[PDB]
Amino acid sequence: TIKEMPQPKTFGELKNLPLLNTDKPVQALMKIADELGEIFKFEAPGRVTRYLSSQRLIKEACDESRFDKNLSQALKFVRDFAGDGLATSWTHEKNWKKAHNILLPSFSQQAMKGYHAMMVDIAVQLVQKWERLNADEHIEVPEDMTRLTLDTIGLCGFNYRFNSFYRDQPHPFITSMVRALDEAMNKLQRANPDDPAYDENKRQFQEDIKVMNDLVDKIIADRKASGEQSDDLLTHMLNGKDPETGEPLDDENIRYQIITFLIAGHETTSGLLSFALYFLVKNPHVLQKAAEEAARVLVDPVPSYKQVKQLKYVGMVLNEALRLWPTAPAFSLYAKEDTVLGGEYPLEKGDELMVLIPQLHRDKTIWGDDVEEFRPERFENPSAIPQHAFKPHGNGQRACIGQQFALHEATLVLGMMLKHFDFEDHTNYELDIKETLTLKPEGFVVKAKSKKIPL
Ligand code: HEM
Ligand SMILES: CCCCCCCN1CCC[C@H]1C(=O)N[C@@H](Cc1ccccc1)C(=O)O
Ligand SMILES: C=Cc1ccccc1
């Protein structure tokens, strides 16, 4: 029953590459999937991959005995500054499992309890900023969510204060990082990346890479000279020993991990919080239900770890926002051996797949006809969701190591926003999704009305 899979329009020797010559490539690929269906071939000079959009096929792709994590071109470009950090290493590189073993305890329950007070520190700064706005000023939502999540990973993970709420402009790090990500996206469609037309891109790229590495220097310097006794992510990087190899991380890999966690540890969580607030102001009945939970649970001026764990509906709200707009919108796999996908598509060892997560999460055979609706109650019973239908944090041993960090932070912060403010979509905002490999609303603004509840 071997089927021929469709393929979108080609451009001679450039094959499908020019389809990525857009500022919204993921959304363009979603439109192609809409037209071609659950699987389509995508070619570029010297490369082939297959975009998967159905749970039927993705549940097979998530079989770790058959498929391993692949570095997409995007991750290969990010590797130019993230090296063999956790997110851009191959599973078979020694430094992947070594750093995984060393850093997994930094995301245990007991670790999350230790981060909680510092996430409250940053969350309170956010609430205080909004309490201090004048009448009919508004909130720049992704901007402030990025302030919050960057500051949280800086403080919680590295005892470093980016002090983003003391800046009306993005931190130097954010500016360079967003620019490096821009360059990585745009480089995806460059057919001649060594054409001298991109000499300045190359120079600017190196400049943004040095900005990010300079902050890494300072984080490392302050820690090793500090006289305070810390027990955080950086402590584990500098002191942890891998049970298997017996070795700690070396200095080069530590630097890559700091870069990795500063980027991965904030950018996707700011997108999640932005999309979540978007859906809440567009769905006031949902906002009300989550606000009622927040008021009933968050009975103290400062939320506790235990209280955040009881914000179960807020948790469902976040999962439903990750369903509709997963902020790291794709991951890539390669076939470990010859194998046949879905009884219809034979693959040879080494063949690559692209999992298009926003399209998977719109599979009507899984979610029903109301798939575009925002209904957190979809997540009331994880046993009623088929396997691998919901993959916002990737798959298997290469799934997101920061999943609990992100969800604790976002649950805490959204709980506090709903406790302390009513929100108004005063511009009737039209969703506009900016792509920087990751996804985030652009230009989303709201007004908050304080409930005047003291901190
Ligand atoms: C809602 C927020 C987040 C989302 C949606 C998300 C999503 C993902 C996805 C889909 C992957 C797999 C990438 C692949 O297969 O190529 C991943 C990997 C990873 N994420 Fe996240 N992430 C989030 C937050 C975080 C945070 C806060 C951190 C750090 C604290 C983090 C650290 C990582 C790391 C290190 C990896 C690589 C894991 C490994 O392969 O060992 N993420 N994330
Ligand atoms: C935080 C998430 C980072 C990883 C997700 C990046 C996901 N890409 C972000 C932009 C679009 C999307 C993607 O489909 N990329 C492919 C593009 C590609 C396919 C075939 C040949 C050449 C290039 C890739 O990078 O290989
Ligand atoms: C998980 C990898 C990643 C890569 C770039 C930005 C955010 C996350």
Curated annotation (Swiss-Prot):
Signal peptide: none annotated. Changing residue 82 to F: 800-fold binding affinity for laurate as substrate. High coupling of NADPH consumption to laurate formation. Very much more effective in indole hydroxylation. Favors omega-2 hydroxylation. Changing residue 330 to P: Enhanced activity with small non-natural substrates with altered product profiles compared to wild-type. This protein is a target of protein engineering. Its selectivity-directing and activity-enhancing mutations have been extensively studied and the designed mutations allow this enzyme to act on non-native substrates and/or in order to enhance production of synthetically desirable end-products. Changing residue 401 to E: Ineffective covalent modification of the heme macrocycle. 2-fold apparent limiting rate of flavin to heme electron transfer for arachidonate-bound enzyme. Functions as a fatty acid monooxygenase. Catalyzes hydroxylation of fatty acids at omega-1, omega-2 and omega-3 positions. Shows activity toward medium and long-chain fatty acids, with optimum chain lengths of 12, 14 and 16 carbons (lauric, myristic, and palmitic acids). Able to metabolize some of these primary metabolites to secondary and tertiary products. Marginal activity towards short chain lengths of 8-10 carbons. Hydroxylates highly branched fatty acids, which play an essential role in membrane fluidity regulation. This is Bifunctional cytochrome P450/NADPH--P450 reductase.
